[PDB]
């Protein structure tokens, strides 16, 4: 979690977000709303399933191997076989939490970047029509916010004919 | 995300995320106990508890152990010309014949459950002046003194032993496991009513190698009833060698060779049951679905099976970060 | 499991006033929205309105805007819906579901009061 | 893929802190000052004594192994012990590096972040009443008594009366 | 961790960068140009050949080992000689995949990272006299040519001289 | 490989118009400017003007301003001079360049098409 | 090891001005201030000023505003105090402390220079 969202200015997540897992809320004059980012959500998914596909699975086929468990005591035959079986149990036991450690880490630096890059798509895609109050939410200063002129939040944000800089943009009380 | 009381002139656009409720707890590099919205489990924590036999033709033990399928236990006559992929041994095998000791056992055991069958071919071998089929009280089959069925007992004719030389050479495309052995007598008055030598001498020898062995005769302690032994030795004849078994006494002569080869046969000790199902990986516990990474059933597999750790648990963060409330 | 309890049956003269209560139980009330849906024996299902139990955000059908006062009470996690001037129309099945949001459908259900208005 | 402050906007550091490892350092008409913050600190702090916990203290037990030190020379057996030592020595050498390499990367990364993140914290939190000045330095175009300092830095700034001052001091000739 | 950078904001590569792997590119009224960034690029390319270095020639000396070819079949000592060999062989193939894959990984957000601190360092260099257009380029609202794109490209940005004439344009126009 | 083949020997009359053409193969034609360079016999190089086959961005020599007009086809690949009022100083060697942008170098050259301008 | 070595003992008329020296060794002296204490011989400490090296920053107390002038030399690492019109009640030891910050507090002080102010 380096990018700062998920647990930064996002103060906490939303329960009821059913479909999708990043997504737009909103409260403008014709009442609440919300909606899921496909796109997003779509490149979480596809990363943490390449580390499924590369996890479950692909299993390699040993089929004849040494003796692990001895009945009986030898000498230098089975303490150098029960040293290379702990050897290899040790070594793949370091591998496999290494491996989860790294890649929880990196799920959770994935995660946060692509909450960071929806909230700063949104931001460049808003530009100087709306201020970012730090909650993570764009406080859009024209009207309409997100029911007729912000279903457009997919890409095709005018900017430029609801260029209301005037109204509280930059206004005197 | 405190959404303000909607003034009709401006509002908020507000984002976030999933945060599904009381998520699982996983293990980062920064933090130890970090809570997410979905994990998968990558340890198979337990087995289906029993054995099972689709892809690989599993061949159970029963109270019988590789070995004396292998030199012809009467008990073990069920496995004779059997092929297997995984030969499961069970802690109940025993021995019912005459007692034995192979001074090689983990390597003849693994040798043979390498090559993965007990196909027997019998060879006209030319015992000239000597007793075959020796029988034994302590090795009974068919409710009569018997032997092992892979193995011949030669034995004195008419107070003679003429000293044994044989040859048998392989002229077929595949390599030939010769079993044979010696026999330890109990006195020296059983070791001359046996083989009319006070002492006997085995030089089994290929092209390539020798193996010269010398009865040991003297007391031990009983099983069933016999204080003797005969202790277990294999030749292997590649093709092109010959095998020239030469003796003077005290040879527990073989019948055939085993045709060995290489492949995906393994042996297994355990004690499942067999059932069905379809699964790739066996362990002594019993088969396990390998759809998971890691493991910590056994450390003994079979097939394609995951890697033995030592963890308990291991989640992978399936899902994003758990932010509640 | 998610729960939402409500009333059996309420005896309720016309002309009075009646306050139906949701009781929610096995999920957290703030994070979910609680809706109303009437049922007459003769007609479809009508959405009444809808509640956001995190800071009491009210929004109700046109139809019944002076009918219907939705409110909630988050100590005891049950959501209450004040009926006034009741009349022989709004006789009929009253069902208390729980959605996710607002334009988010609804996933649970209650059992449904029915409310005869009758003398 | 570090952030660009530890070394790159935030110039050339400070040394000052004898406290705390980030924190903030101002300028206003009462006088300069410094001051630490103990957000991003304990994170910072948290996640490195996390990363020490993993290591340090943590030792498996080793009791009967295999010799490892030959006096005689032999055949088979000394080769395939000294083989297997040799083995498990490199291999324990190269997780080694790997280990110490890969978290040598995260935690300067980590300091990376959690330098940039309180910056971005700051960026929201002063609105449109400061700006960047690439140094890493923010121009605040109001004037205070402190307080406004003293209210940056735990959390508790608002825009307040210094919002239409502020961007008449912005937005002048 | 990634910036959304090389495939965010940034929608293509440019086919004709022919020096340096990051650059500018400008639109004025003396016509089109375009030029690379040294530092930027010396960056990752130090990085990738620093990867490179510890890759590349570092070559352990194994003159006397263990038989890993047998052609007769001896049992308990060639079962575990294989058996070590072939544990060798697949601990090395994990470290091999996994260290190819984190360079890998490590090399994207690296060069991702770049791309987005240099377009974040040009972004402060030009306060109030650019806005994020949100495709990479910027909407330099002043009557910028070949010396002022050349100071921007060049770190003596001024930002102050052109402040004016950027707020009008930026505001009003 | 890349290449940038032209036409061997145009004969026009003088007072007329020609065509020039420069087919590009073997590379991405968007991605990559084409230049254009003049060389008289008796002179050096002379650069004409320069064109960006993504959106056909002009811009020319002072001296070649009303000589020559530069036009990319992007489905077959080509580049065109649309050359007027043909004089007896205009017979020279004309050169199409691949540079990459404005101000790079010119990567790959053409083969030279010779343009006689005489009767 | 880290120090302030300063000038034992002057002995200055009253009514005459006087430069006290600090010299600063084991450490970068200009990223760390230089403050100014000054103890009476029944009093206790008072602060007199703070200087940041790097820029010569000043701001002293409201009782020695006219007294103190704090200069500091980055080539030598010697921070001096220009007091001005010495009296009777100006005879005291000074003190000089590195310090991280304005608020950080002195972490190394130096030996002291008594200014036995008479005649
Ligand atoms: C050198 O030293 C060894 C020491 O190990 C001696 O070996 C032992 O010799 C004795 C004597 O021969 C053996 O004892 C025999 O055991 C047989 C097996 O016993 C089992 O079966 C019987 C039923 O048959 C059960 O009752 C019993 O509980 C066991 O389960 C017995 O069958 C033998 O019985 C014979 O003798 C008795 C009289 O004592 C008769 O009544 C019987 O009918 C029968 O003829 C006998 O008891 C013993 O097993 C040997 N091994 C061990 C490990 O002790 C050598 O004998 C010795 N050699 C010399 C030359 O001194
Ligand atoms: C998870 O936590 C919730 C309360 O937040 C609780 O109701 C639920 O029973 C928990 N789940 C389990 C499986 O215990
Ligand atoms: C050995 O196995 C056979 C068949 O599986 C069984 O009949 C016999 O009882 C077993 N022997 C013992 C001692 O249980
Ligand atoms: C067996 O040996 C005898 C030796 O007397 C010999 O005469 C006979 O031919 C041999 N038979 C075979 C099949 O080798
Ligand atoms: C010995 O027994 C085998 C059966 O395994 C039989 O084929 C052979 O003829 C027998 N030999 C003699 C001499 O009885
Ligand atoms: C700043 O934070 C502190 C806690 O460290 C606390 O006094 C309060 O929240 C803020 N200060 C003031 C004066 O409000
Ligand atoms: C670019 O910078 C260099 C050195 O920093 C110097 O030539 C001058 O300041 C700048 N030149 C131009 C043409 O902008």
């Known amino acids: 979690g380096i990018f700062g969202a998920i647990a930064g200015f996002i103060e906490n997540g939303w329960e009821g977000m059913v479909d999708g897992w990043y997504g737009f809320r909103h409260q403008n004059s014709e009442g609440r709303g919300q909606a899921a980012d496909l796109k997003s959500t779509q490149a979480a998914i596809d990363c943490i399933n390449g580390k499924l596909n590369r996890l479950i699975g692909k299993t390699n086929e040993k089929f004849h191997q040494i003796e692990k468990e001895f009945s009986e005591v030898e000498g230098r035959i089975q303490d150098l076989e029960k040293y290379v079986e702990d050897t290899k149990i040790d070594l793949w036991s370091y591998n496999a939490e290494l491996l989860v450690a790294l890649e929880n880490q990196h799920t959770i630096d994935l995660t946060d970047s692509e909450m960071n890059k929806l909230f700063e798509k949104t931001k460049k895609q808003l530009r100087e029509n709306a201020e970012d109050m730090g909650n993570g939410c764009f406080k859009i200063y024209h009207k309409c916010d997100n029911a007729c002129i912000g279903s457009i939040r997919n890409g095709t944000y005018d900017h430029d004919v609801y260029r209301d800089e005037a109204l509280n943009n930059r206004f005197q009380i | 995300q405190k959404l303000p009381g909607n003034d009709n002139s401006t509002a908020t656009l507000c984002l976030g995320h999933h945060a599904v409720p009381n998520g699982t707890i996983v293990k980062t590099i920064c933090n130890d106990q970090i809570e997410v919205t979905n994990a998968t489990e990558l340890v198979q924590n337990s087995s289906i508890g029993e054995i099972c036999d689709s892809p690989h033709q599993i061949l159970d033990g029963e109270n019988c152990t590789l070995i004396d399928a292998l030199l012809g236990d009467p008990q073990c006559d069920g496995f004779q010309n059997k092929k297997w992929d995984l030969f499961v041994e069970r802690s109940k095998a025993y021995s019912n014949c005459y007692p034995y000791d192979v001074p090689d056992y983990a390597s003849l055991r693994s040798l043979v459950a390498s090559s993965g069958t007990l196909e027997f071919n019998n060879e006209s071998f030319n015992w000239t002046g000597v007793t075959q089929n020796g029988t034994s009280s302590a090795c009974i089959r068919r409710s009569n003194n018997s032997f092992f069925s892979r193995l011949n007992w030669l034995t004195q004719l008419n107070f003679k032993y003429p000293a044994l030389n044989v040859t048998m050479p392989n002229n077929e495309q595949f390599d030939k496991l010769y079993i044979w052995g010696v026999h330890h007598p109990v006195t020296d008055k059983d070791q001359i009513f046996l083989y009319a030598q006070s002492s006997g001498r085995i030089t089994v020898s290929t092209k390539r190698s020798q193996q010269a062995v010398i009865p040991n005769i003297g007391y031990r302690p009983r099983i069933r009833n016999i204080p003797s032994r005969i202790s277990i030795y294999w030749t292997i004849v590649k093709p092109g060698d010959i095998l020239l078994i030469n003796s003077t006494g005290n040879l527990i002569a073989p019948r055939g060779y085993f045709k060995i080869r290489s492949g995906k046969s393994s042996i297994m000790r355990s004690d499942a049951p067999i059932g069905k199902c379809n699964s790739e990986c066996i362990t002594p516990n019993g088969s396990i679905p390998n759809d998971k990474p890691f493991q910590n059933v056994n450390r003994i597999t079979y097939g394609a099976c995951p890697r033995y750790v030592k963890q308990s648990t291991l989640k992978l963060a399936t899902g994003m970060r758990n932010v509640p409330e | 499991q998610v729960q939402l309890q409500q009333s059996g049956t309420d005896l309720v003269m016309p002309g009075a006033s009646v306050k139906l209560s949701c009781?929610?139980?096995?999920?957290?009330?703030?994070?979910?929205w609680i809706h109303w849906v009437k049922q007459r024996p003769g007609q479809?299902?009508?959405?009444?309105?809808?509640?956001?139990?995190?800071?009491?955000?009210?929004?109700?059908?046109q139809k019944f805007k002076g009918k219907a006062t939705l409110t909630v009470d988050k100590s005891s996690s049950t959501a209450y819906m004040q009926l006034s001037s009741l009349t022989s129309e709004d006789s009929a099945v009253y069902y208390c579901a729980r959605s996710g949001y607002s334009n988010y459908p609804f996933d649970y259900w209650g059992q449904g009061t029915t409310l005869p208005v009758s003398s | 893929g570090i952030f660009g402050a530890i070394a790159g906007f935030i110039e050339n550091g400070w040394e000052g802190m004898v406290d705390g490892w980030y924190g903030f350092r101002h300028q206003n008409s009462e006088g300069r000052g410094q001051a630490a913050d103990l957000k991003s600190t304990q994170a910072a702090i948290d996640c490195i004594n996390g990363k020490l916990n993993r290591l340090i203290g943590k030792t498996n037990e080793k009791f009967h192994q295999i010799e490892k030190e030959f006096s005689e020379v032999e055949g088979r057996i000394q080769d395939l012990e000294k083989y297997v030592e040799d083995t498990k020595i490199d291999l324990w050498s190269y997780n080694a590096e790997l280990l110490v390499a890969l978290e040598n990367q995260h935690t300067i990364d980590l300091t990376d972040s959690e330098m940039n993140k309180l910056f971005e914290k700051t960026k929201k939190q002063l609105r449109e009443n400061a700006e960047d000045m690439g140094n890493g330095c923010f121009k605040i175009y109001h004037k205070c008594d402190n307080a406004c300092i003293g209210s940056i830095r735990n959390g508790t700034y608002d825009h307040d009366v210094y919002r239409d001052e502020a961007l008449n001091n912005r937005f002048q000739i | 961790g990634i910036f959304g950078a090389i495939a965010g904001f940034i929608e293509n590569g440019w086919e004709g960068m022919v020096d340096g792997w990051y650059g500018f590119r400008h639109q004025n009224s003396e016509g089109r140009g375009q030029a690379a960034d040294l530092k930027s690029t010396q960056a990752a390319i130090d990085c990738i050949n620093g990867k490179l270095n510890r890759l590349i020639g570092k070559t352990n000396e194994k003159f006397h080992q263990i038989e890993k070819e047998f052609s007769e079949v001896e049992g308990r000592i060639q079962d575990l000689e294989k058996y070590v060999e072939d544990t060798k062989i697949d601990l090395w193939s994990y470290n091999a995949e996994l260290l190819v894959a984190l360079e890998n990984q490590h090399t994207i957000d690296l060069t991702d990272s770049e791309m987005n601190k240099l377009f974040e360092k040009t972004k402060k260099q030009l306060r109030e006299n650019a806005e994020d257009m949100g495709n990479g380029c910027f909407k330099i609202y002043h009557k910028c040519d070949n010396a002022c794109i050349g100071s921007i490209r060049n770190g003596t940005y001024d930002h102050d001289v052109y402040r004016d004439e950027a707020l009008n344009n930026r505001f009003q126009i | 490989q890349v290449q940038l083949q032209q036409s061997g020997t145009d004969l026009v009359m003088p007072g007329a118009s020609v065509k020039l053409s420069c087919k590009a193969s073997?590379?991405?034609?968007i991605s990559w400017w084409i230049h254009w360079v003049k060389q008289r016999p008796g002179q050096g190089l002379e650069?004409?003007?320069?064109?960006?086959?993504?959106?056909?961005?002009?811009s020319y020599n002072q001296k070649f301003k009303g000589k020559a007009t530069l036009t990319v086809d992007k489905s077959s690949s080509t580049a065109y001079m649309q050359l007027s009022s043909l004089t007896s100083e205009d017979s020279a060697v004309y050169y199409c360049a691949r540079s990459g942008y404005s101000n790079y170098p010119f990567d790959y050259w053409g083969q030279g098409t010779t343009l006689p301008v005489s009767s | 090891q880290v120090q302030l070595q300063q000038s034992g003992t002057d002995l200055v008329m009253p009514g005459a001005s006087v430069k006290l020296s600090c010299?600063?060794?084991?450490?970068?002296?200009?990223?760390?201030w230089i403050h100014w204490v000054k103890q009476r011989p029944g009093q206790?400490?008072?602060?007199?000023?703070?200087?940041?090296?790097?820029?010569?920053?000043?701001?002293?107390?409201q009782k020695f505003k006219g007294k103190a002038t704090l200069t500091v030399d980055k080539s030598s690492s010697t921070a001096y105090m220009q007091l001005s019109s010495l009296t009777s009640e100006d005879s005291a030891v000074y003190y000089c402390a590195r310090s991280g910050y304005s608020n950080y507090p002195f972490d190394y002080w130096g030996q002291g220079t008594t200014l036995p102010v008479s005649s």
């Open positions: 073997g590379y991405t034609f």
């Open positions: 650069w004409i003007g320069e064109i960006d086959p993504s959106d056909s961005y002009t």
